[PDB]
Design a protein around this ligand. Structure first.
Ligand SMILES: *[C@@H]1O[C@H](CO)[C@@H](O[C@@H]2O[C@H](CO)[C@@H](O)[C@H](O)[C@H]2NC(C)=O)[C@H](O)[C@H]1NC(C)=O
Ligand SMILES: OC[C@H]1O[C@@H](O)[C@H](O)[C@@H](O)[C@H]1O
Ligand SMILES: OC[C@H]1O[C@@H](O)[C@H](O)[C@@H](O)[C@H]1O
Lengths: 254, 263
């Protein structure tokens, strides 16, 4: 299975290079016949071929080293990564991926699984502490290729690549750091907006296309940790800037 | 697959002109009471429930178009007695409260308090902008376009160009009104008014008047276009040095993409 791939070389990469790198990783999973106000609804396992299920991402740090990770075309999750003929899979890791994920490399299995609730645990640290940006991305990349791969490092790439294409907000955030060679830490907003991807996913498919109002609400948060319940599409995009929707249901007002 | 659970009756507010919410005159639930503008607040005559039948009713009385022709004002009344094709509505993402049958949309002739609403011809103007939510407070955020620069406003009746993003500066702070008009956060009395409908027209910052050139729909694709024409707000020749933001057909090129980056 010659799985496709989207590569991003940290080697003197500009911000405009980040915007394109994400657009590629996006279109690689945006291929489908289901839209809503513009944003697409990633396909489901029920209709995803074993030769189109995954997509690789080659992230090369400053030292030239390159690490490739597989992102599920269904939920845009990180299933595994490989560095120096060394692939690593989570505890659960559905046997469906391993069977055709990095086939031809020394397989590995972490003691934890893919999900913030777990990752943050297997690192004695929360995302609100882990920093992101050019350098943090490099060090995180090195920590994987060199130290095999531990939570922390992954927590950086996840919010710096998949979660970066899901929400354009996080993009312009890492776009300012990539260009200004600066770093930062997820704020109450950025964090909350990425903790309700599924919730805000059904509120868009539930209301239906063209329908601005939302049946329910999304408990987002401001920088001051103040509750910001979004109940409409526009108000949602203007803040989060969502660009990808996780299939939670199909339209009804057909 | 799995169809979506038929949404239940949810209650929200409706703003769409200078930051005023559509309120039921005097608050009387009696049939016939017209609908108009009034400062948002805690009141039953301002909260509206949305049902599957596409009927928005406050106090328990469905919002119906008194008449059925360009000019007919709006008001409430018993859902059972009022005409069916006059009680249904449609809240599009363009902020336009249209009426399937009459094909007309809710219109606010003036942002002045008490201004009685009235279904008028749909011409895509900042007068027909309407956002439903419990938060009447507009969004405060910047707009990064090309070269990671932010679109900053200067003085009244003056073009808008991209300057080095300065969060502290107020000359780059914007307020996304619910009426679908972008006004400078500082003096929320000036909206980003275009200068025409023909591609290659400048975009300055002048007073708000529900103008059609002041209608902005943040396309999910990232572009910021006006409702009337398909023209998009971008940077001339992708060159920010020109200090000229204009309207141009959707090309899909970077210099046509924007992003409201919160406060
Ligand atoms: C956007 O501008 C408004 C005023 O137009 C700022 O509001 C402040 O907070 C309230 C609400 O308006 C009022 O007391 C004043 O108008 C403002 N000053 C203070 C001290 O509160 C609002 O802060 C601005 N938004 C941003 C992000 O700066
Ligand atoms: O818009 C007219 C207004 O009239 C007032 O008398 C009433 O208290 C308000 O709730 C509103 O109905
Ligand atoms: O160069 C002429 C035009 O080219 C378009 O692609 C761009 O979106 C416009 O903003 C303008 O630059």
């Amino acid at each position: 299975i010659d799985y496709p791939s989207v590569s991003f070389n940290l080697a003197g990469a500009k911000s405009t290079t980040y915007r394109d790198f994400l657009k590629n990783l996006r279109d690689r999973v945006a291929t489908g016949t289901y839209e809503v106000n513009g944003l697409p609804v990633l396909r489901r396992e029920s209709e995803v071929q074993v030769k189109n299920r995954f997509v690789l991402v080659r992230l090369t740090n400053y030292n030239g080293d390159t690490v490739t990770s597989a992102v599920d075309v269904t939920n845009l999750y990180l299933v595994a990564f490989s560095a120096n003929g060394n692939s690593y899979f989570f505890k659960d890791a559905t046997e469906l991926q391993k069977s055709n994920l990095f086939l031809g490399t020394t397989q590995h299995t972490l003691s934890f699984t893919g999900n913030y609730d777990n990752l943050e645990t297997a690192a004695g640290t929360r995302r609100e502490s882990i920093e992101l940006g050019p350098n943090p991305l490099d060090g995180a990349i090195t920590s994987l290729w060199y130290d095999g791969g531990v939570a922390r490092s992954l927590l950086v790439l996840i919010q710096m690549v998949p979660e970066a294409a899901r929400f354009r907000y996080i993009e312009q955030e890492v776009r300012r750091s990539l260009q200004q060679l600066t770093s930062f830490t997820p704020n109450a907003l950025m964090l909350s907006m990425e903790n309700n991807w599924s919730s805000m996913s059904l509120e868009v498919q539930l209301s239906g296309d063209n329908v601005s109002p939302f049946s329910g609400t999304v408990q987002l948060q401001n920088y001051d940790h103040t509750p910001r319940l979004v109940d409409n599409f526009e108000e949602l995009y203007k803040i989060t800037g969502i660009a990808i929707l996780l299939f939670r249901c199909v339209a009804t007002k057909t | 697959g799995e169809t979506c659970a038929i949404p239940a009756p949810f209650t929200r507010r409706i703003v769409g002109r200078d930051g005023l919410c559509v309120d039921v005159r005097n608050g009387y639930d009696t049939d016939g009471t017209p609908i108009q503008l009034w400062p948002c607040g805690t009141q039953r005559n301002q909260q509206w429930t949305f049902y599957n039948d596409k009927t928005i009713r406050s106090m328990g009385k469905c919002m119906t178009a008194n008449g059925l022709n360009s000019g007919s004002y709006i008001m409430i009344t018993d859902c059972s007695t009022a005409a069916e094709d006059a009680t249904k509505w449609e809240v599009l993402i363009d902020g336009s409260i249209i009426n399937p049958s009459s094909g007309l949309v809710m219109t606010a002739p003036s942002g002045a308090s008490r201004t009685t609403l009235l279904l008028e011809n749909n011409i895509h103007a900042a007068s027909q902008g309407w956002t439903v939510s419990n938060d009447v407070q507009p969004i405060a955020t910047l707009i990064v376009g090309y070269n990671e620069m932010c679109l900053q406003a200067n003085g009244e009746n003056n073009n808008v160009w991209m300057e080095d993003c300065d969060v502290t500066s107020v000359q780059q702070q914007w307020a996304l009104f619910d009426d679908r008009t972008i006004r400078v956060n500082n003096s929320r009395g000036l909206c980003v008014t275009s200068n025409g409908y023909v591609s290659k027209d400048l975009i300055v910052i002048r007073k708000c008047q529900g103008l059609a050139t002041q209608r902005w729909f943040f396309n999910s694709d990232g572009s910021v276009v006006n409702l009337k024409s398909t023209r998009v707000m971008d940077v001339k020749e992708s060159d920010v040095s020109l200090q000229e933001v204009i309207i141009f057909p959707a090309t899909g090129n970077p210099n046509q993409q924007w992003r409201t980056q919160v406060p």
